[PDB]
Design a protein around this ligand. Structure first.
Ligand SMILES: [K+]
Ligand SMILES: [K+]
Ligand SMILES: [K+]
Ligand SMILES: [K+]
Lengths: 555, 552
């Protein structure tokens, strides 16, 4: 019984009745069909919820069902009589046509309508694409019309975008055709959700902060090295006007009718891998418990959820879910696929340190309440689960068995109860929030602080190129903001083949740039794909529509 | 009072009420906010009309300062509604591009508007994004096929498909893509057009339903192989996915006039390289849901009206019941040589030198297309009683009445005389300029001689060769779409008046095999406008509440 079969076999509730559960009326929402609606963001200036973060262990090529657990947890809280909202990211449209689409969640833990969310949804990503490309066209128009700001054509760092998996646009030359048609320069397209516009869209408090952030975008450098901004080009009003409706969070729902926001969807390497701040804040204003998540494992996603999103937005998670599976741990202990359906306590024993490292980071470094969610598969023996529970309990952390894939909200009551226990009226902590690094430190000491404390690196090495880039960013006033580290998700090191809990290793930063409007430094550790390619046989080939307009072949 | 202020000062009816006027339940429509809806296209095949009376709004040869064809189009519909006739106005959705370069504008004007005006000028219901995505998906699939082995044996230098963005971006007119070594694609020359110039928009507009959409896309010629044979979107298995991307967009957008007349706004191709009409599915939907439908075509009757009949009506199987030809006194005086500025003071000489242009359009409609015509004049206050009488007198001598229209100032009240005449014209086989079985040259000669009044048509040696390749490849039974300047009946924009003793020169001929017509270019054709020195974008702004200002 497919995710698509499951999603189609369930009568969804009209979105006005889902909105009713949040005390929203016809006047608070803009409908986009029967099962989708945008919530006016002006509600946010007239108490707040407990915030739960769903993160996970180091990911495998397949998955650990993080998003599925994130949905399942919210459905469970709802059943226990808690007014709850699950907040998630919108997937980009590109992959749907290359390597198949997929569910928001899975099993009986989904957010729906599945088909619309995968396609145009409410048009957020299209608005973001238009804004990015307007900016680019305004940069080139300015150069063409006389280049008053003295932009060095070879130093425009702003890139164009489309939400299609198109390798042909990674490296291009545009502005050709003689003097009436542009001025030649090297350029390229990123997949829309990699644009700084998407990261900014997700870190904005409101429409005004969006506009002020957009204005700070560095689009190019002039001929003596000084940054030129979207503000210099007077683009920020037009971009924000283009993003006016998009920035209203999208209200949809779970298979059990828990209210749900789907909004924003940045990269989790070159950006912070979270859904939008405005949506998270909206959920906390309308509910008593909010469940959300961040991309990849807890070394990237949660680190950036806390040290970037929470920091700049002024939020604090009240508890963290660390998702794990017996399979993924045994893979981390070096068992190799196809050999993972059999019980192996030795292999599991060698995989647990990874989980423990992530639990240690959440409980000791970030100092947050935590529960471990094992997504129970059928072949998970009684001993294997007991083993995970014992090792976790020795750090003082509980394990909840999650069966939400198979049973929906009923399969995550134990997790939900633990989360209620963990967050029990004890907010306390006038302290504030524990971050990995402080803002006033130099860029290399933040990268070092993250690499050592979170990844468990001995140290971080820097190339001469990286070092020079850091120096010039310190000068230009960018030395006092969060640092986003772009590395592989499949390992705690920057070498993806190093599984388990690696030690006696370093990270190596090869490139450092600023997302000035987003408000963070991006530190790349090698190669980061910004535009995926279509396979030999794209999924598009088998996507069809019939006489009556029903789409087939997306899943 | 400005157009946006009027559009923001009128209290609009919930679109569900508007839908009810047409007998549509909750149920039959997808709401996009309180004042917009998409109507399900499965209501077509549904049952059986009982088709409406179809009214085509066209115009004289345009000047830079427009003649308000759209406003008259909206007003004739509002008038008809006030005369108790169940009416829908059908219009084109405008592209986003120009709004950020030279500021947007009303859908119509004055008290003859379709609204919400802001939404229509931005993302609306997202139709143009779906189109852009479909076009750009196909382009990605063409390149992927080449990158992955190139079974179809495409010549990389003969990929004629082009990418799309709805931004006025001259930087993308001419590009090289597929650079960065073997891992990043295959080098070729390429470029973007503005989205609404893509064949996907023309096909979007000519499709009868979702199955006709899919089958038209399959026939898109994306490239040629190394031995001259066309490769298609169908060969790439792209048509299903393109249609999936366009599944919702293809449902017509139901909105309203200021007075609450049901309006469709849907589709919007060029009127030079394409046919300049709103979508067939929206017109057909309107003719199904109503008794009168008022719609329009881009530019003057030599371009828009010619193609509305010879391309849209031919392929869609429609027949207009009457034609409105819009003109103004100022426009005619301009066309009779009077050089701007003075287009304010009376000048019965210059008017009499402009009128022939009008009479040529009237002749083409009433004698060549053999259709009931009415000339509607958008009366300005500075128009003298004698100027207006001279236009009426010259028109009455050909058998055509003149209705004074003041729908700009007075709304539907100002189009009563026009509407009453339309009722009279529609109470008291379609004639095409050419037959499909004629060769391409002869079809181009037919339009040029009968409609523009040219002596003959000249072709370059390149055009003759291109034409011949299309004849042999089996594209010779298709309608022909002549792309040329709108500001003149010739292909020289300077030639105002009713020019005599001229020829047209066809310099380039290609095919939109999906859309089903040949495009014949006669001069420079700008498919991607650029931004001015100071883009309108610079003064567009949004406040903490999320109100946009500076858009108009
Ligand atoms: K999507
Ligand atoms: K560049
Ligand atoms: K538009
Ligand atoms: K080309």
């Amino acid at each position: 019984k497919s995710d698509i079969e499951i999603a189609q076999s369930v009568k969804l509730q009209d979105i006005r009745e889902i909105a009713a559960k949040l005390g929203l009326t016809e006047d608070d929402i803009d409908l986009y069909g029967k099962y989708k609606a945008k919530v006016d963001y002006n509600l946010l200036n007239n108490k707040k919820a407990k915030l739960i973060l769903t993160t996970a262990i180091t990911p495998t090529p397949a998955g650990e069902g993080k998003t599925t657990t994130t949905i399942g947890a919210a459905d469970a809280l709802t059943r226990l009589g808690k007014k709850t909202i699950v907040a998630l990211r919108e997937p980009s449209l590109g992959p749907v046509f290359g390597i198949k689409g997929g569910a928001a969640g899975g099993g009986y833990a989904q957010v729906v309508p599945m088909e619309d969310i995968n396609l145009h949804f409410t048009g957020d990503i299209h608005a973001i694409t238009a804004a990015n490309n307007l900016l680019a066209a305004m940069v080139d128009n300015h150069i063409f019309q006389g280049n008053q700001l003295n932009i060095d054509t070879r130093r425009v760092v702003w890139r164009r975008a489309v939400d299609i998996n198109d390798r042909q646009l990674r490296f291009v030359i545009d502005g050709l055709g003689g003097k009436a048609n542009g001025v030649p320069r090297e350029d390229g397209f990123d997949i829309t959700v990699a644009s700084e516009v998407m990261a900014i869209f997700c870190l904005a408090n409101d429409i005004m902060d969006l506009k002020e952030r957009l204005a700070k975008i560095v689009v190019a450098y002039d001929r003596e090295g000084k940054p030129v901004t979207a503000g210099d080009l007077k683009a920020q009003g037009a971009m924000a006007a283009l993003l006016k409706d998009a920035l209203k969070p999208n209200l949809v729902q779970t298979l059990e009718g828990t209210p749900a926001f789907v909004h924003g969807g940045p990269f989790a390497n070159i950006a912070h891998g979270c859904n939008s701040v405005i949506a998270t804040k909206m959920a906390m204003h309308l509910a008593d418990y909010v469940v959300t998540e961040a991309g990849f494992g807890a070394d990237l996603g949660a680190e950036k959820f806390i040290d970037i999103k929470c920091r700049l937005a002024g939020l604090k998670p009240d508890a963290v879910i660390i998702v794990a599976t017996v399979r993924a741990l045994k893979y981390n202990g070096g068992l190799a696929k196809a050999d993972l359906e059999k019980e192996d306590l030795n292999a599991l024993a060698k995989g647990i340190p990874n989980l423990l490292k992530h639990v240690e980071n959440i409980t000791q470094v970030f100092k947050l309440p935590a529960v471990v969610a094992i997504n129970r598969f059928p072949q998970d023996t009684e001993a294997e689960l007991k083993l995970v529970e014992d090792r976790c309990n020795e750090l003082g952390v509980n394990v909840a068995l999650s069966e939400v894939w198979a049973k929906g909200g009923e399969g995550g009551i134990a997790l939900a109860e633990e989360l209620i226990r963990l967050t029990e009226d004890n907010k306390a902590s006038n302290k504030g929030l524990a971050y990995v690094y402080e803002l006033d430190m130099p860029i290399e000491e933040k990268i070092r602080a993250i690499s050592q404390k979170i990844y468990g690196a001995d140290d971080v090495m820097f190339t001469d190129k990286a070092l020079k880039e850091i120096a010039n960013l310190e000068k230009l006033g960018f030395g006092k903001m969060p640092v986003c580290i772009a590395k592989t998700q499949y390992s705690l090191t920057d070498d993806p083949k190093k599984l388990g809990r690696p030690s006696g290793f370093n990270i190596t930063v090869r490139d450092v740039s600023v997302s000035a409007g987003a408000g963070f430094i991006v530190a790349v550790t090698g190669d980061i794909m910004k535009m995926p390619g279509l396979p030999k046989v794209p999924a598009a080939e088998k996507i069809d529509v019939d006489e009556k307009g029903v789409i087939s072949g997306l899943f």
